[PDB]
Amino acid sequence: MKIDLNADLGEGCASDAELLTLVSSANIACGFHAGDAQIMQACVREAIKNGVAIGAHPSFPSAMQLPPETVYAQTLYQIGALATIARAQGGVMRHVKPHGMLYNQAAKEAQLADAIARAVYACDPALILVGLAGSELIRAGKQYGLTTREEVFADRGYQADGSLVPRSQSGEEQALAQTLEMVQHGRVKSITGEWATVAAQTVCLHGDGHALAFARRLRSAFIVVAALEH
Amino acid sequence: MKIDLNADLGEGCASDAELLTLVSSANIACGFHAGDAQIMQACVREAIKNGVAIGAHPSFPSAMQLPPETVYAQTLYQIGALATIARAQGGVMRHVKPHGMLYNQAAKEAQLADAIARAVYACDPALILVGLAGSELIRAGKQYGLTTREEVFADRGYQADGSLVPRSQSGEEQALAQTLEMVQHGRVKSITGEWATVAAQTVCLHGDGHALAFARRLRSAFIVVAALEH
């Protein structure tokens, strides 16, 4: 039984250095929401240095719809930039995970999820699409023959249906146990009390802290952390 | 005897439409100095529509040196973005031509020319590097085994050594004859009166005008306009 741990990098924030020592996959910003070519270049090198799988963390450039075509184009632009930077160093970009609001909206909007999946596919069919467990992005991914991996969160509360409870409450290190529960037996205790089934193939480790202690403690609690090799 | 004509596009300016009807190669902006992913996406489609060779027009993001490493990284970022957008449409990016100040400075600074050439090579060794005739960029290109094409200008005055006279005077449609002279016999009458030898493998057509008349008139004057197939 293996589990993949991923962290967002290329934002210049937090300590990407130490976090790359305890994570199996990296999601590198592509210059829109954060980072730049030079930062992307240094993140890739550090990633290969630690044997971490290189992945892109594309983002968007009051819910005004941005046509799927535009998102598709902007996604290609970002992941193609990183893939080229990665290959220049003899590295290979292995996955793509949307960032923030793009990720959040693609989780519920089929059209947006579809746009992102198509872009990942158009870049390289062998790329693994990472998205929130049980969301539209996972659906879009498998819809196009893309290997897809579902993401779960250690510090977030889940509903009965298996999705997250809207931030706040929808307008403690119990996280460990929740994380261990999802990875080991694919289920999580919802805030409603009922058990909800989940895929949990990768857990997102927040490094923006001293929140680095939880990361290492999570691994101590853990069996075998490894990159997605589907 | 063939000649290649190129035009800068993806800047939203001028009439890229009509210019793509009389040019053999296109240099598409990559989102830094101008353009964006969507614009790049539409330019590529129009390029394949007119059978025009797709090329990148990367730029920089009081001559303060930007380390070659940075330029290298930023160049990869831009041309990799366009190459991915191009391939997504079943197209192929064929050449790279630096934009404005980056082009202007790489013409004289070996280190900068070297950085750009290495980036083009790291992206795809089969890419044609385009630079000012007799400049450092052409040298850097052939230095790395890259097919290189020298650019000449119809509306600019040349010196005896074969380089351009600094803008203004260095702090008429005679252009046609000058252009015909360079393409047909590889030489140009300098403002000093002496004949200067040049490679002239491609001429840059300014479409930012009614300067489109000169473009068509240049072709009327011309034999066989074709893309670089070295």
Distance, in Å, from the CA atom of A81 to the CA atom of B87, rounded to the nearest integer, reads 13
Cβ of A80 within 8 Å of Cβ of B83? The answer is: yes
Q: Which residues pair with A5 in a beta bridge?
A: A203
Distance CA A48, CA A54 (A): 8
Give alpha helix (H) positions in A14-67.
16-22, 37-49
Q: How far apart, in Å, do the first and last CA atoms of chain B sit?
A: 14
Q: How many CB atoms lie within 10 A of CB B21?
A: 13
Cα A25 from Cα A160, distance rounded (Å): 29
Residues of chain B with C-beta less than 8 angstroms from the C-beta of A37: 70, 73-74, 76-77
Q: How far apart are CA A147 and CA A136, in angstroms?
A: 14
**Are B81 and A77 an interchain contact pair (Cβ–Cβ within 8 Å)?**
yes
**CB within 8 Å of A22: residues ≥ 6 apart:** A5, A205, A215, A216, A219, A225
Q: Residues of A with CB below 8 A from B116's CB?
A: none
Residue with tokens 């579902």: A150
Q: What is the dihedral of CA A137, A139, A144, A149, to 10 degrees?
A: 70
What is the rounded CA–CA span in Å between residue A180 and residue A19?
20
- Please give, rounded to a whole number of angstroms, the shortest distance from the CA of B118 to a CA of chain A: 10
Interface contact B84-A81, CB threshold 8 A: yes
Task: Identify whether the C-beta of residue A207 lies closer than 8 Å to the C-beta of residue A215.
Answer: yes
Q: In this complex, how many residue pairs, one in chain A and one in chain B, have their CB atoms less than 8 Å apart?
A: 81
Alpha-carbon distance of A39 to A36, in angstroms, equals: 5
Sign of the four-CA dihedral B227, B7, B112, B34: negative
Residue linked to tokens 């270049």:
A41
Give the 3-state secondary structure of residue A86: helix
Q: Which domains does chain A have, with CATH numbers?
A: 2-230 (3.20.20.370)
- Sign of the CA dihedral running B102, B106, B111, B115: positive
Are A29 and A57 a contacting pair, CB within 8 Å?
Answer: yes
- Contact yes or no for A40 and B84 at CB 8 A: no
Q: How far apart are CA B155 and CA B134, in angstroms?
A: 18
* Contacts of A46-51 spanning 24+ positions with Cβ under 8 A: A46/A16, A46/A17, A46/A20, A47/A9, A47/A20, A47/A91, A48/A89, A48/A90, A48/A91, A49/A20, A50/A20, A50/A21
How far is residue A12's CA from residue A175's CA, in Å, rounded to a whole number?
A: 26
Nearest to B37 by CA among A49, A71, A129, A161: A71
Q: How many residues does chain B have?
A: 230
| Torsional class of B196: left (φ above 0), alpha (ψ -120 to 50), beta (otherwise) | beta
DSSP conformation letters of A176-224 = HHHHHHHHHHSEEE-TTS-EEE----EEE-------HHHHHHHHHH---
